[PDB]
Each structure stands twice: as C-alpha cells, then as structure tokens.
C-alpha cells in the first residue's frame, strides 16, 4: 500500500551514514606481479 507512515524502528543516524559511506572502499589494488625470467628484465 506504500503508505505505512509509521516511524521506522531504526532511524538513520549520522555515524551510520559515514560507516556505510566508508564501506564503499575496498582493499588496495592487486596488480599481477612482474616476472623476471632473465637478466634483461632484471637490469
């Protein structure tokens, strides 16, 4: 009926806003490590 104006049991708090903002970050990017199979890629 999309008309349930009842106040929500949980209210949006600021700290919730910032916590669910920072959840958007991930781990540091993982690049495929370069392989040095001879002296050329070493030098």
């Amino acid at each position: 009926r999309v008309k349930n104006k009842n106040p929500a049991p949980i209210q949006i708090s600021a700290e919730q806003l910032l916590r669910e903002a920072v959840e958007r970050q991930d781990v540091a990017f993982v690049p495929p490590k370069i392989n040095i199979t001879d002296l050329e890629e070493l030098q």
């Binding site: 490590k33 392989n35 040095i36 199979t37 001879d38 002296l39 070493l42």
Partner: peptide, 24 residues
Amino acid sequence: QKIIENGIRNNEMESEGRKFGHFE
C-alpha cells in the same frame, strides 16, 4: 650472481605457481 639467479628462480616458480595455485 646468486641474487640474480635466486630472483630468476623465484620468478619462475611463481609463474608456474599461477598454474600450481590456480584452483587451490
């Protein structure tokens, strides 16, 4: 010399370790 050779061995082992650790 050994440090170069160790780097080459470790890179070779990790390159085949991609297949080795492909499924784990």
